[PDB]
Paper text:
S-adenosylmethionine (SAM) is the principal methyl donor in cells and is essential for [name] gene expression, influencing RNA modifications, translation, and ribosome biogenesis. During translation, peptide bond formation occurs in the PTC, predominantly formed by 16S rRNA during the late stages of mtLSU assembly and involves the folding and methylation of the A and P loops.
States B-D exhibit a mature CP but still an immature PTC, which remains bound by [name]-MTERF4 heterodimer along with an array of state-specific factors, including GTPases, [name] (states B-D), [name] (states B1,2) and the methyl transferase MRM2 (state D). In state B2, [name] was stably accommodated, and H89 moved ~14 Å to align with a basic cleft formed by [name] and [name], acquiring its mature position. This is consistent with cryo-EM structures of bacterial LSU assembly intermediates, further supporting a conserved role for ObgE in ribosome biogenesis and adding to the previously reported human mtLSU intermediate (PDB 8PK061).
Author numbering:
A (entry chain D): 62 to 276, 286 to 297
B (entry chain 2): 47 to 92
C (entry chain d): 43 to 51, 57 to 80
D (entry chain 9): 14 to 135
E (entry chain 3): 94 to 188
The structure:
RNA sequence: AACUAAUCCUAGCCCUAGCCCUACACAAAUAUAAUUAUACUAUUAUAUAAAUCAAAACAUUUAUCCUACUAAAAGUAUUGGAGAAAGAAAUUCGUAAGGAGCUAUAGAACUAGUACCGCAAGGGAAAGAUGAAAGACUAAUUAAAAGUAAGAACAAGCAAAGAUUAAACCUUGUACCUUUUGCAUAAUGAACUAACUAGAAAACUUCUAACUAAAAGAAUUACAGCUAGAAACCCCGAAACCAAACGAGCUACCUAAAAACAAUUUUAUGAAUCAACUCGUCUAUGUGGCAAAAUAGUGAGAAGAUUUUUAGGUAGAGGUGAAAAGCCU
RNA sequence: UCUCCAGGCAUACGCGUAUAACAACUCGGAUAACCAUUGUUAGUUAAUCAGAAUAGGCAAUAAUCACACUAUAAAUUACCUAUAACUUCUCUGUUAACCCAACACCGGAAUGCCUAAAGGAAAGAUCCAAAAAGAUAAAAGGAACUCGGCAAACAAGAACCCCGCCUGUUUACCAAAAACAUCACCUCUAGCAUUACAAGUAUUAGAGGCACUGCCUGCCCAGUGAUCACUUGUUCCUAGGGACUAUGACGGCAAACGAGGGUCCAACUGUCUCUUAUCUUUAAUCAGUGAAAUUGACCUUUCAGUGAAGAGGCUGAAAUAUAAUAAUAAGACGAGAAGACCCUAUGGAGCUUAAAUUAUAUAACUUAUCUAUUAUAUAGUAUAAGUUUGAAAUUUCGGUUGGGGUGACC
């Protein structure tokens, strides 16, 4: 009887009501422990493909206007409503984004380096080595999947030929084509790691059930009389 | 606490748990009815 | 366990007199001789 | 402790449970919950004029009863259809194609009262 | 022992007797001596001679073996050139 | 000099024989929360049976279970921790309505899969008795069971026996079954009445006959044997194990939609005092109780990780668990 | 009419005629009256209470008197564009003292309104014995009681140790705690999308440990020259020759809080010295109704003996009209429960592993098989055969040794 709530085909900026799982799967059995209850929430459909040209428009760099930078219950970072042309779409907000700012979304692969302004989306080839980036996509057109948390910025270590190396926040180096689109700057809510829960009830407000109260080298034969 | 009152009646719950439509939903439930028909039960299901 | 209370039914007259009854008169099929 | 043997009716169960007692529907429920009764769906009692009717509920005990001969298709056919076909055959004005002339109906479609599937109540 | 079989309703022979003992028609049973093929290097010459012999069974042992085998193993067998032809009967036996 | 009771005979049932079946019965309703006249949401068994048990344990294995014609070949060939056990074939033979059964605790569970018990799967009873006629007023028959009544008792004792003129006084006498040990003043079991309630098989031996170097109505045995008859080996009772259904209306946790929190002080709260509400600290009562966990007091929390309501989910090789190996009627 | 008591009326859920009248007086109410019982007849009335056309386009801005006010846990069909139809009221719920607890059960039972205008009766009659239960009063003393201030009090104040940070959570039915959870802190694992984690992305997620804060100190940190050379170290080529090498895992302590476990003082008292009086319950007598465990048979005595710790019943003395009513509990090794304790079974089961036997759970590799390619070759793979890993599965628990370590012994 479990029908997923993620059944909306068409993009909208209206917040969408979420049904909670409880750590259980479509079978009805717990698959992850420690999830339950909490505050009711609404899902605002984020758009991680920064360079999405508007319908019936050409594929070239465009600009959008930041309406508001808002708190999002469903993620560590904060979201910014951005409007351009006749389209409104939620997006992740960088560290310094404010209302009324203008942010560029560029398709052009700069043959030379392009000056980097935080919040604008540029292909990795355009950016210069060393620039802090966020919302990186693995393959051109996929959409952003890495560096999407609060205050998490990766570095662009190297660009050679058609590919570049990205240092993910975990210090794990990844390689992607220079065509991939990465947003510049940090991801905002840099102090999220400084937040203090304080009381056990606060985690029960975020849907975190308490931990359960339940409290390997086989010797080789030649080394069993010394164990 | 005092036990013995584990039955909290509800017609919606009863017909959903042990009703005609529920029994026919799975083949094992159909065989529940087949046994009771063979035995001669006056009540096949709730 | 227990056994059921069967009510366990010159006697019909008392039965119907206590209960009360509509005894419609009957036409005797054979005339009395 | 629920009673499994008594009949399930609308008096039992919560308010949400409702079901009919066997009365035929006479209308339709539109959206926003408006009942619209349909005049044609409501039965009409066709009552004849009984003025000057000689038949009453009971019959004379002196009236002889008749031997039972339940009606058969052959008896109906002979009483009604045989006289025409027999006379027509002698006249020679007979063919298989013109069976409608004697009262045959190839199909029941288009008739107000269809003999099969029956589309009228008693 | 199987006294009444499921298929035939009879007793069954214990095929461990059939593979170890010979029954003479008179009623006697022959056997070998346990260990006659074992560790012969450390056995005395007289001991080995005793082991090689064919030996008879006691009254109770014979009574047991008769219980464990069926009648077919107790019939008189007319084998041409039998080397036990003369041992199937008792002679000069008053007892 | 009689109450409670007792007597009873047929309702049906049992095993065979024979036989393929063509019983699947008005109108209407019903797969919707079945039995609700019409659209909405469409509809669909199962991969190898397992274990108990036998092997005096158990670990390969363990007849039937898991069917292919009778009698013989034959418990033979074979198969097997070569143990317990298991076990063929070639080949031959083959033309056919009844009861030394039951008669109401028996025979079917059956007067009924009902009443009743259980959320459900499921479990599952008891009983009737006139006569030709009841349009003869529903009879009779029986010192007859235990139990009582008619009719309490009268120094002294396993309750009787020997006796006696005499019921009791006198004399003699350590209840029963099993069990200890072949003993108990041990110890188990027994309120009493009626009914019901536990030894079953033919390898060898013995006995009685038929025929006899042969016996047997084919297949077998035989150096007096062979054929037939007769003669035999209990009842009740676990914790367990496995397969398939049924269960989350209790309880554990969860999902969705809803509710409740006065007054007072702090502040801006898993803060304070204290109701409603939730819980169950200590003592007494109760202990077949009002209650298979309560009552009366006294207490802990009481805007929160609070409490409560409704509907849904997770199922036993599992579920749930702020782990008590708690909870899952 | 009087005396007294103080959760009542609606709806939901549930129940299913217990509703009302009459007639009955068998059964049912634990007894009567009377009926909640039996039979017969009746009943609940709704257009407002309650239940039961199609296709597109699009949504930033809580609630709390919503203004101010901040906040954090971030929080409810409409309006438009076209199409289609162009006057309608049937059906069903409606009673009651009611449901779940085997019962007319001192229990359980959601919400709104209200707190006596609604709803009710603690005593069948009598008697005031013991023992038992409950309430109130106490001369003088005031914990001397007791395992302990348990219980009670005209008291309800003050402090100190131990443990746990704190509010929370648990062994429904003997354990509410020092156990569990908890913010904080710490270790480990994972670089990723269309059903959990999650419509998330390392400031994330999962697994697990652990009080925090401040304070302390172990490890570890090539050696000597001094950013430089040797000695080392590690590899090779043959004892030679090259090659290469620029900070902590541990303790010690912090207030507040606690139906936790110890302790003290003050006050207070019938806990006690040392009990008493009153009232209610029960008791007892009268009327009605009427169980339960238990029971070999009993015409059921005391003392000494005998006996296995043991005698109403045996041996020898002794005592002895018969039956009730109300009391006590020495005995009938008094009666009950699934209570305890040791031992036994080639009886079980739960749990753990380093028991034996297995293990197409996952994971990996290897060879085939089948495709792609390629110069032989690297890829993959509806399967088979190996190997490695081990989630699991099945089975077992020799003997002798006041009983338990080890040993030993057969
Ligand atoms: Mg823990
Ligand atoms: Mg029950
Ligand atoms: Mg409930
Ligand atoms: Mg065995
Ligand atoms: Mg086995
Ligand atoms: Mg019977
Ligand atoms: Mg019967
Ligand atoms: Mg008598
Ligand atoms: Mg005497
Ligand atoms: Mg004893
Ligand atoms: Mg076993
Ligand atoms: Mg539930
Ligand atoms: Mg308040
Ligand atoms: Mg508080
Ligand atoms: Mg309090
Ligand atoms: Mg408090
Ligand atoms: Mg819990
Ligand atoms: Mg524990
Ligand atoms: Mg249970
Ligand atoms: Mg009434
Ligand atoms: Mg009356
Ligand atoms: Mg009545
Ligand atoms: Mg309405
Ligand atoms: Mg009403
Ligand atoms: Mg009672
Ligand atoms: Mg009043
Ligand atoms: Mg009263
Ligand atoms: Mg009184
Ligand atoms: Mg006082
Ligand atoms: Mg005093
Ligand atoms: Mg003292
Ligand atoms: Mg002291
Ligand atoms: Mg106290
Ligand atoms: Mg604590
Ligand atoms: Mg607490
Ligand atoms: Mg407890
Ligand atoms: Mg609890
Ligand atoms: Mg507590
Ligand atoms: Mg407790
Ligand atoms: Mg702890
Ligand atoms: Mg406490
Ligand atoms: Mg003092
Ligand atoms: Mg009396
Ligand atoms: Mg006496
Ligand atoms: Mg004595
Ligand atoms: Mg004496
Ligand atoms: Mg008395
Ligand atoms: Mg006594
Ligand atoms: Mg033994
Ligand atoms: Mg065993």
């Amino acid at each position: 009887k479990f029908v997923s709530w993620k059944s909306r085909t068409k993009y909208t900026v209206k917040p969408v009501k979420m049904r909670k799982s409880g750590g259980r799967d479509h079978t009805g059995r717990i698959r992850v422990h420690g999830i339950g209850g909490g505050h009711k929430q609404n899902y605002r459909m984020i758009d991680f493909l920064r360079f999405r040209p508007e319908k019936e428009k050409a594929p070239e760099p465009f600009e959008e206007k930041v309406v508001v930078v808002r708190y999002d219950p469903c993620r560590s970072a904060d979201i910014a409503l951005v409007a351009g042309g006749s389209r409104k779409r939620w997006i992740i907000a960088t560290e310094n984004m404010k209302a009324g700012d203008t942010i560029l979304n560029s398709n052009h692969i700069g043959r030379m380096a392009v000056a980097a302004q935080e919040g604008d989306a540029h292909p990795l080839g355009a950016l210069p080595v060393g620039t802090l980036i966020n919302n990186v996509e693995s393959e051109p057109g996929r959409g952003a999947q890495y560096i999407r948390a609060a205050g998490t910025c990766g570095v662009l270590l190297r660009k050679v030929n058609g590919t570049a190396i990205i240092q993910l926040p975990s210090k794990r180096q990844m390689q992607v084509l220079e065509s991939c689109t990465a947003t510049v700057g940090r991801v905002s809510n840099v102090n999220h790691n400084q937040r203090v829960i304080g009381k056990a009830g606060r985690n029960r407000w975020l849907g975190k059930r308490p931990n359960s109260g339940l409290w390997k080298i086989r010797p080789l034969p030649p080394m069993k009389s010394y164990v | 606490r005092a036990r013995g009152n584990e039955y909290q009646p509800s017609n919606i719950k009863r017909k959903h748990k042990h009703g005609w439509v529920r029994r026919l939903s799975t083949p094992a439930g159909v065989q529940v009815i087949l046994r009771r028909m063979l035995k001669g039960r006056k009540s096949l299901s709730h | 366990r227990f056994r059921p209370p069967t009510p366990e039914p010159k006697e019909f007259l008392e039965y119907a007199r206590k209960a009360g009854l509509v005894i419609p008169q009957e036409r005797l099929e054979r005339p009395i001789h | 402790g629920a009673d499994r043997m008594s009949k399930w009716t609308s008096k039992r169960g919560p308010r949400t449970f409702t079901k009919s007692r066997g009365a035929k529907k006479t209308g339709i429920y539109t959206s926003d919950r408006k009942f619209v009764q349909i005049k044609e769906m409501v039965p009409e009692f066709v009552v004849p004029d009984l003025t000057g009717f000689k038949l009453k509920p009971y019959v004379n005990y002196r009236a002889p009863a008749g031997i039972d001969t339940p009606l058969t298709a052959k008896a109906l056919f002979q009483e009604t259809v045989a006289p025409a076909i027999e006379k027509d055959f002698k006249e020679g004005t007979f063919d298989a194609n013109n069976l409608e002339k004697y009262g045959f109906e190839p199909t029941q479609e288009g008739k107000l009262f269809q003999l099969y599937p029956k589309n009228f109540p008693r | 022992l199987t006294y009444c079989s499921t298929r035939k309703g009879k007793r069954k022979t214990v095929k461990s007797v059939v593979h170890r003992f010979l029954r003479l028609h008179s009623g006697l049973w022959l056997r070998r001596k346990a260990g006659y093929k074992k560790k012969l290097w450390k056995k005395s010459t007289a001991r080995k001679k005793r082991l090689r012999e064919f030996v008879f069974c006691s009254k109770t042992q014979s009574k047991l073996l008769d219980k464990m085998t069926t009648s077919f193993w107790k019939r008189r067998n007319w084998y041409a050139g039998d080397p036990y032809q003369m041992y199937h009967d008792r002679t000069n036996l008053r007892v």
